Amino acid sequence: GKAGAARIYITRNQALKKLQLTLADFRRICILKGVYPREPKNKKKANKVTFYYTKDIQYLLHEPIVQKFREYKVFARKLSKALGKGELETAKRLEARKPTYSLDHIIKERYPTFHDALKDIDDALSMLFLFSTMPVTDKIGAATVANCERLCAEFQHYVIRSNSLRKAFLSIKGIYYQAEIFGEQITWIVPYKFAQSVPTDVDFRIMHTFLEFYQALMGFVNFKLYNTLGLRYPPKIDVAKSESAAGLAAYELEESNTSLFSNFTFFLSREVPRFSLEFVIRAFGGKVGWDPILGSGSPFSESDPVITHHICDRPHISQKYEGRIYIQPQWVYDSINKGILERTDLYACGATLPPHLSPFVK
Amino acid sequence: FKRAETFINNYRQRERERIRLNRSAKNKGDIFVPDETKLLFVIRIAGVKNMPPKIRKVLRLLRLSRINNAVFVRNNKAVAQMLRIVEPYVMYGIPNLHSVRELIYKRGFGKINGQRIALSDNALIEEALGKYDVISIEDIIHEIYNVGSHFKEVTKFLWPFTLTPRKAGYCGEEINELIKKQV
Amino acid sequence: GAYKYLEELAKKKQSDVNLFLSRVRAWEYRQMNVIHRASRPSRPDKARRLGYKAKQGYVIYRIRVRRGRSARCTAEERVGRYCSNLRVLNSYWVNQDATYKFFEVILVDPSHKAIRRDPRINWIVNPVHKHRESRGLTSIGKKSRGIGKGHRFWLRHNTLSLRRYR
Amino acid sequence: LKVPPAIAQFQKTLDKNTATQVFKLLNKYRPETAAEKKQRLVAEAEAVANGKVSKKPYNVKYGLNHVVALIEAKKAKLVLIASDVDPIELVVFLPALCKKMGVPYAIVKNKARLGTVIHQKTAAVLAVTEVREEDKNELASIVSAVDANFSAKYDESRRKWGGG
RNA sequence: AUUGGAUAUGCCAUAUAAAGCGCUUUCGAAGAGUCGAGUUGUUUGCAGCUCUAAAUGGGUGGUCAUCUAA
RNA sequence: UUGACCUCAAAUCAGGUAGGACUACGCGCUGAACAAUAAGCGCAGGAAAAGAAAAUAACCAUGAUUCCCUCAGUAACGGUGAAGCGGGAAAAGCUCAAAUUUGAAAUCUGGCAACAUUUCUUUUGUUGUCCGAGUUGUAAUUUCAA
């Protein structure tokens, strides 16, 4: 009763009571740090409900996350006090000096080596990519969304520069990219740019906490990768280019089949998802051009005849030129996944699209 | 319940608005008419009860029947005159190409069969705008940005944007910044 | 100032305003403990002139004693025992009824830095003032043992003083 | 129970409308905070440390000894007494002193509300002594309202033993 | 070796400050269940109980002198 | 409603402090017998207590307290038994409450961060910042001698 399997596991209420933290705070600490439920072999004996090891609860007792959470809550109450009393200056000044937190200790504890963080960054990359296109809402943070988009752009630029991308598959949910960094394999899913809507069914607080932890892990990984490759962390970003929807062109990679399409100048019109096509072409070492509608800062133009392949999903090309025969994104995706250039005639405009084989499927 | 001072305050605003419309119409029939922008974004800031009948009619014509409603319109003398009349309750600015694309991708919804339907798929846009040579969201965005012949038809098909939470009057390029805060 | 009005109102102890407050508060104090902490003195004029300052280190305690030795002397001693870490500064009468006499005792914390850094109450920190009320060194204690100047107020007469040359 | 008239008068406080209008004028004349005072003084300190005459300040008067001295000097135009002072005898003479000195006075609710005007937890009494020329009509209208809504009202009620 | 009060001297010094003396067509707050009265006990003082103040007032002395409690 | 204020509690929360012992001398309370008596109880310090006149005097006036000598075995009382003056030792005076800083709470504790300092790595402070205390009153100013 008082010993054995009963002491082996701690109930959710018992663990919260020992840590003296609320359910929301405990969930945030568990999500930020490394803690998962552990069902004992003898559930009846473990209860003398969710079960957690006492070692995790013992470690979480001295965790500074709970203390930081109280400081944020205590400061928030003081900020509310100033607003009610009518002294706006006190609240405005106290806003700047509000408490914050650091995840460096948690990241080191959860991932002692960069290899473990890289292997566990597949979920972080997928979360960052998904949140990079989601609309700004009250639950989400506009600065957090911008930071996630910047982190995703920096990761794409680093992957393109290092040519770490290996496979690219076009799925219904989005684009699945498989890359090998430091031996570890990282898989990310980039949702398509569509007019989606909030399901209003999942917990926003849990998702935001997971996204914040994912962003911190992605930022630390990007800084380590930039230092290893000599790139400047963070890379320089052009404000004018960012306002012009230049994509990765704004993020300058300033220094502080990897050539499947190297001898090719791909061009994309305003009818295909050039966000993923440009990244795939850049990761392959080739040159990717986009129409002015898709974005600014395009090195090439539509009238330029130097483009060997013109990517266009439209069924009609009134201004088709010579030497720039239309190709489909399926051929490019198949070529990237297989490492060998596909047949442009087979995937030409107005022709049947060949089936897309998933590179992850063996 | 409603306090007596509230009703007088509403009356004083009504008398304040009546004079302002009298200023703009008589002896001041000149509008700024900003140039270098064929398309502008107008968002209804707020409205009060017992609003002037002329302002409500202008809002109905401009589809601003509800607050925090964003609509893209073409720069014209008639539009500028209507904007000046409803300047206190409407904020105007110059939208950007990136902002327009982001708004269409985030809160871009059209009016299909009299109902506001989000443009999550290009099939609905192609069917609704088959005669307008519009088949995808990018084509509609490009036509709106370029202000083509079918832009008016596209604007009618597209439902007004809901940029729920600002200064009053012309905002210029700063209106595009508010779009980033809304989408 | 307002302490001129408060102190002249405290002379009319059976007036309409003072009698109603005496009977209302006497009931309230009886529901409380025998010795209970006072958030602020019930007589801010009388405490102020007896050495009380509204600052950290100054404590006011209320105590009721049965009517029927000096009543004020026992209030000082009982509160001093209750708060053994404080020094009894002074005390005064706040209220009474048919059974109880209510007193408020001013105590000073000799360990608080606001007391030890204040030269005007620095004297109470010295050990010679440990339990002043216990040795008859307070205002009522001094009055109790007839200490004063004048004709109105032993060992050197029961002894034979024999000098060297006598 | 039965209460004397001098304590019974504190149960008849100023009405919600007049009190709300009173605090609109009071909130224009709040004393500067400890932070705002430091900012103003350090700003003049730099003008002295490097190298270089004002008007009299305007604020609401607070403090029991301070306000009573202002009434006795007839310097106060409006005196607002808290209705819930913990020892009532602290302000039990103020309505009579204000009557003797011809000072328009009112008993307002929530001594905490009075303290909020002066950036304090608690104030027993507030007093407006002299305001800017812009607010002469606003203060004059308030004093006329206090005359009707507090002095003309009650009055006969304040001389009667309350309670029972 | 540890110290104290001075002396000499270098530096610093928030003095737009702070004091004593002098003069007045201006002012000058002073401690209450205490003083005191009756009465009951302890050893005049003190203590209880009942009552309970004043403002050139109050105390103690021989109209005057002296003092200024709580 | 949010939210301030007042409460009433809680915390193995932070920093503190009290107890017991000695008790020759010291200051209270209490107390019989053969007298503030022994005992009994309470509380200090290197001395304690007292102390800068609600004091004496009746003079040409004295001038906080304490101790010694004298007054004096006197007055007075009912054998008890002082005191004023006088002579010595030593000498030191002051602090508040009661005034509006009102042209500016000018005041203070604590946390934190630096910089010092030491009977001392053990001690004691300074400066800056934030929070709290405080207008139901913390500083400067005043204490009748003015």
Curated annotation (Swiss-Prot), chain A:
Disulfide pairings: none
Gene Ontology BP, a term: assembly of large subunit precursor of preribosome
Taxonomic path: Eukaryota, Fungi, Dikarya, Ascomycota, Taphrinomycotina
Protein known as: Pescadillo homolog
Ranges that cross the membrane: none
Function: Component of the NOP7 complex, which is required for maturation of the 25S and 5.8S ribosomal RNAs and formation of the 60S ribosome.
Domain BRCT: 257-349
Assembly notes: Component of the NOP7 complex, composed of erb1/SPBC4F6.13c, ppp1/SPBC19F5.05c and ytm1/SPAC890.04c. Within the NOP7 complex erb1/SPBC4F6.13c appears to interact directly with ppp1/SPBC19F5.05c and ytm1/SPAC890.04c. The NOP7 complex also associates with the 66S pre-ribosome.
Keyword annotations: Coiled coil, Nucleus, Ribosome biogenesis, rRNA processing
A molecular-function term among this protein's GO annotations: RNA binding
Subcellular location(s) per record: Nucleus, Nucleoplasm; Nucleus, Nucleolus
Domain of life: Eukaryota
UniProt similarity note: Belongs to the pescadillo family.
Predominant location: nucleus
Any one annotated GO CC term: nucleus
Residues of the full protein shown: 8 to 454 of 607
Keyword S-adenosyl-L-methionine (UniProt): no
Species in which this protein is naturally found: Schizosaccharomyces pombe (strain 972 / ATCC 24843) (Fission yeast)
Curated annotation (Swiss-Prot), chain B:
GO cellular component: cytosolic large ribosomal subunit; nucleolus; preribosome; preribosome, large subunit precursor
One Gene Ontology molecular-function label: RNA binding
Functional note: Component of the ribosome, a large ribonucleoprotein complex responsible for the synthesis of proteins in the cell. The small ribosomal subunit (SSU) binds messenger RNAs (mRNAs) and translates the encoded message by selecting cognate aminoacyl-transfer RNA (tRNA) molecules. The large subunit (LSU) contains the ribosomal catalytic site termed the peptidyl transferase center (PTC), which catalyzes the formation of peptide bonds, thereby polymerizing the amino acids delivered by tRNAs into a polypeptide chain.
Iron found in the keyword field: no
Keywords associated with the record: Cytoplasm, Nucleus, Ribonucleoprotein, Ribosomal protein
Protein name according to UniProt: Large ribosomal subunit protein uL30A
Taxonomic superkingdom: Eukaryota
Miscellaneous note of the record: There are 3 genes for uL30 in S.pombe.
Predominant cellular place of this UniProt entry's protein: cytoplasm
Compartments (UniProt record): Cytoplasm; Nucleus, Nucleolus
Subunit details: Component of the small ribosomal subunit (SSU). Mature yeast ribosomes consist of a small (40S) and a large (60S) subunit. The 40S small subunit contains 1 molecule of ribosomal RNA (18S rRNA) and at least 33 different proteins. The large 60S subunit contains 3 rRNA molecules (25S, 5.8S and 5S rRNA) and at least 46 different proteins.
Gene behind this protein: rlp7
Organism: Schizosaccharomyces pombe (strain 972 / ATCC 24843) (Fission yeast)
Keyword ATP-binding attached: no
From Swiss-Prot, chain C:
Alphabetical list of InterPro entries matching this protein: Rbsml_eL15_core_dom_sf, Ribosomal_eL15, Ribosomal_eL15_CS, Ribosomal_uL23/eL15/eS24_sf
Cellular localisation: Cytoplasm; Nucleus; Nucleus, Nucleolus
Keywords: Cytoplasm, Nucleus, Ribonucleoprotein, Ribosomal protein
Region spans: Disordered: 134-153
Main location: cytoplasm
The UniProt record lists the keyword Nucleus: yes
Cellular component terms (Gene Ontology): cytosolic large ribosomal subunit; nucleolus; nucleus; preribosome
Any one GO biological process: cytoplasmic translation
Highest rank taxon of the organism: Eukaryota
GO-annotated molecular function: RNA binding; structural constituent of ribosome
The keyword Transferase is annotated on this UniProt entry: no
Basic residues bias: start-end ranges: 142-152
NCBIfam families, per database record: PRK04243.1 (NF003269)
Subunit structure: Component of the large ribosomal subunit (LSU). Mature yeast ribosomes consist of a small (40S) and a large (60S) subunit. The 40S small subunit contains 1 molecule of ribosomal RNA (18S rRNA) and at least 33 different proteins. The large 60S subunit contains 3 rRNA molecules (25S, 5.8S and 5S rRNA) and at least 46 different proteins.
UniProt family annotation: Belongs to the eukaryotic ribosomal protein eL15 family.
Note, other: There are 2 genes for eL15 in S.pombe.
The name this protein goes by in its record: Large ribosomal subunit protein eL15A
Swiss-Prot record, chain D:
Gene Ontology annotations of biological process type: cytoplasmic translation; maturation of LSU-rRNA
GO MF term (any one): structural constituent of ribosome
Gene Ontology CC terms, in alphabetical order: cytosolic large ribosomal subunit; preribosome
Keywords on record: Cytoplasm, Phosphoprotein, Ribonucleoprotein, Ribosomal protein
Broad class of where this protein is predominantly found: cytoplasm
Signal peptide span: none
Domain of life from the UniProt record: Eukaryota
Keyword Lipid metabolism: no
Subcellular compartments: Cytoplasm
Free-text function comment from the UniProt entry: Component of the ribosome, a large ribonucleoprotein complex responsible for the synthesis of proteins in the cell. The small ribosomal subunit (SSU) binds messenger RNAs (mRNAs) and translates the encoded message by selecting cognate aminoacyl-transfer RNA (tRNA) molecules. The large subunit (LSU) contains the ribosomal catalytic site termed the peptidyl transferase center (PTC), which catalyzes the formation of peptide bonds, thereby polymerizing the amino acids delivered by tRNAs into a polypeptide chain.
Subunit note: Component of the large ribosomal subunit (LSU). Mature yeast ribosomes consist of a small (40S) and a large (60S) subunit. The 40S small subunit contains 1 molecule of ribosomal RNA (18S rRNA) and at least 33 different proteins. The large 60S subunit contains 3 rRNA molecules (25S, 5.8S and 5S rRNA) and at least 46 different proteins.
Similarity comment text for this entry: Belongs to the eukaryotic ribosomal protein eL8 family.
Protein name: Large ribosomal subunit protein eL8
Gene name linked to the record: rpl8
